[PDB]
Design a protein around this motif. Structure first.
Motif, PDB file in Angstrom:
ATOM      1  N   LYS A  38     -10.634   4.219 -10.841  1.00 47.85           N
ATOM      2  CA  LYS A  38     -10.006   3.109 -11.606  1.00 47.85           C
ATOM      3  C   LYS A  38     -10.054   1.760 -10.911  1.00 47.85           C
ATOM      4  O   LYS A  38     -10.362   1.122 -11.554  1.00 47.85           O
ATOM      5  N   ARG A  39      -9.357   1.658  -9.878  1.00 46.43           N
ATOM      6  CA  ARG A  39      -9.191   0.631  -8.993  1.00 46.43           C
ATOM      7  C   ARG A  39      -9.959   0.787  -7.852  1.00 46.43           C
ATOM      8  O   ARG A  39      -9.176   1.572  -6.918  1.00 46.43           O
ATOM      9  N   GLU A  40     -11.099   0.693  -7.412  1.00 44.28           N
ATOM     10  CA  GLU A  40     -12.013   1.404  -6.350  1.00 44.28           C
ATOM     11  C   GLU A  40     -11.602   1.545  -5.000  1.00 44.28           C
ATOM     12  O   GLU A  40     -11.069   2.775  -4.551  1.00 44.28           O
ATOM     13  N   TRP A  41     -11.573   0.609  -4.377  1.00 44.79           N
ATOM     14  CA  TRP A  41     -11.126   0.363  -3.189  1.00 44.79           C
ATOM     15  C   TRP A  41     -11.720   1.585  -2.190  1.00 44.79           C
ATOM     16  O   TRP A  41     -10.972   2.667  -2.027  1.00 44.79           O
ATOM     17  N   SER A  42     -13.033   1.789  -1.849  1.00 42.16           N
ATOM     18  CA  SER A  42     -13.872   2.524  -1.552  1.00 42.16           C
ATOM     19  C   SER A  42     -13.371   2.966   0.182  1.00 42.16           C
ATOM     20  O   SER A  42     -13.957   3.573   0.518  1.00 42.16           O
ATOM     21  N   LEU A  43     -12.470   2.078   0.828  1.00 46.79           N
ATOM     22  CA  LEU A  43     -12.371   2.322   2.177  1.00 46.79           C
ATOM     23  C   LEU A  43     -11.770   3.610   2.672  1.00 46.79           C
ATOM     24  O   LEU A  43     -12.572   4.464   3.236  1.00 46.79           O
ATOM     25  N   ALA A  44     -10.606   4.005   2.279  1.00 48.36           N
ATOM     26  CA  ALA A  44     -10.210   5.426   2.414  1.00 48.36           C
ATOM     27  C   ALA A  44     -10.726   6.326   1.506  1.00 48.36           C
ATOM     28  O   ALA A  44     -10.733   7.429   1.816  1.00 48.36           O
ATOM     29  N   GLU A  45     -10.938   5.860   0.448  1.00 45.71           N
ATOM     30  CA  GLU A  45     -11.798   6.736  -0.438  1.00 45.71           C
ATOM     31  C   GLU A  45     -13.287   7.225   0.196  1.00 45.71           C
ATOM     32  O   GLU A  45     -13.557   8.308   0.027  1.00 45.71           O
ATOM     33  N   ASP A  46     -13.555   6.408   0.884  1.00 43.58           N
ATOM     34  CA  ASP A  46     -14.727   6.918   1.674  1.00 43.58           C
ATOM     35  C   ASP A  46     -14.432   8.242   2.660  1.00 43.58           C
ATOM     36  O   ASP A  46     -15.294   9.164   2.499  1.00 43.58           O
ATOM     37  N   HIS A  47     -13.452   8.251   3.366  1.00 45.58           N
ATOM     38  CA  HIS A  47     -12.887   9.372   4.162  1.00 45.58           C
ATOM     39  C   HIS A  47     -12.701  10.529   3.176  1.00 45.58           C
ATOM     40  O   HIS A  47     -12.935  11.709   3.325  1.00 45.58           O
ATOM     41  N   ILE A  48     -12.079  10.318   2.214  1.00 45.88           N
ATOM     42  CA  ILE A  48     -11.531  11.329   1.154  1.00 45.88           C
ATOM     43  C   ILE A  48     -12.668  11.633   0.356  1.00 45.88           C
ATOM     44  O   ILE A  48     -12.867  12.893   0.312  1.00 45.88           O
ATOM     45  N   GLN A  49     -13.801  11.043   0.363  1.00 46.11           N
ATOM     46  CA  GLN A  49     -15.147  11.519  -0.200  1.00 46.11           C
ATOM     47  C   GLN A  49     -15.950  12.409   0.847  1.00 46.11           C
ATOM     48  O   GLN A  49     -16.836  13.031   0.421  1.00 46.11           O
ATOM     49  N   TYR A  50     -15.609  12.100   2.396  1.00 43.35           N
ATOM     50  CA  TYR A  50     -16.262  12.642   3.276  1.00 43.35           C
ATOM     51  C   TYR A  50     -15.608  14.241   3.126  1.00 43.35           C
ATOM     52  O   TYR A  50     -16.213  15.318   3.200  1.00 43.35           O
TER      53      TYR A  50
END
Length: 269
Positions: A205-217
């Motif tokens: 919804k409010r993207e901010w892929s930084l920590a989302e990147d590790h949680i997507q790891y």
């Protein structure tokens, strides 16, 4: 069939005499402190509206002494029940109710009392639209009492914090995945899975892929075995190592992401 509701209506309108018998019993009882609270909650099963207030009062006064404060705690939450059948609800009584948790939390470590006290707070403040308060006291609860109960209460308090306003999902997201780990640890799978999904959707919804990147790891570790690879592939692809300041373990991680997207390309080709 019909006999059930027949006997049901007759039994209800014979219990009205039975509740009258119990009213007589309690009017005899007013003539011990445990007897007083039994009186209270028994007529609360059918919920006396004002005798609620008098039981509230008497229980408070006496259970200032007798420092086993489950009496007094339960007393003020049944006062909140009264507030349900009280239009004013003396809304500061809700503050009393908040009082209820914080002191009585420390009174006895039987956490279930804190749990449903906070839950009654939740519901009653939801009868006031001012969810902000119960949002804060539930978030101050959920850190403690477990690493599992902490997790489902983290999402409970979390979505509740979001009930007042849709945005500011930030700490919502953080603690709900930092509890989704515990959800995978010791939770029934449908609730933990709805954790993962709603958390991830809140991310997008409010993207901010930084920590989302590790949680997507982490999405990948559940995708390198179970979930779909392409989501992790595109997640790391949008991170795009150069210009995103990735680290040594992150470069190796996107090597592994290349491995997963290689599996996906091979299965497509």
């Amino acid at each position: 069939d019909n006999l059930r509701h027949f006997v049901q209506d007759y039994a209800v309108r014979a219990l009205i005499p039975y509740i009258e018998h119990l009213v007589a019993i309690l009017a005899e009882g007013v003539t011990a402190e445990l007897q007083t609270r039994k009186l209270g909650d028994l007529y609360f099963m059918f919920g006396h509206y004002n005798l609620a207030f008098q039981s509230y009062h008497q229980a408070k006064r006496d259970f200032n002494a007798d420092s086993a404060w489950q009496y007094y705690a339960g007393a003020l939450e049944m006062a909140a029940l009264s507030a349900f059948m009280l239009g004013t609800a003396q809304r500061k009584t809700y503050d009393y109710m908040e009082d209820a948790i914080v002191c009585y939390l420390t009174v006895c470590k039987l956490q279930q009392f804190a749990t449903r006290a906070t839950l009654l707070s939740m519901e009653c403040l939801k009868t006031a639209r001012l969810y902000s308060e119960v949002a804060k006291q539930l978030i101050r609860m959920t850190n403690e009492e477990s690493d599992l109960r902490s997790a489902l209460l983290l999402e409970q308090a979390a979505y509740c914090f979001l009930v007042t306003q849709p945005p500011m999902h930030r700490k919502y997201a953080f603690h709900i995945v930092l509890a989704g780990n515990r959800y995978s640890r010791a939770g029934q799978r449908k609730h933990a899975y709805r954790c993962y999904r709603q958390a991830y959707q809140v991310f997008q919804k409010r993207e901010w892929s930084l920590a989302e990147d590790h949680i997507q790891y982490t999405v990948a570790k559940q995708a390198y075995m179970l979930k779909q690879l392409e989501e992790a592939s595109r997640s790391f692809a949008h991170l795009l190592r150069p210009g995103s300041l990735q680290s040594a373990q992150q470069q190796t991680s996107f090597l592994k992401e290349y491995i997963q997207t290689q599996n996906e390309l091979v299965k497509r080709s």
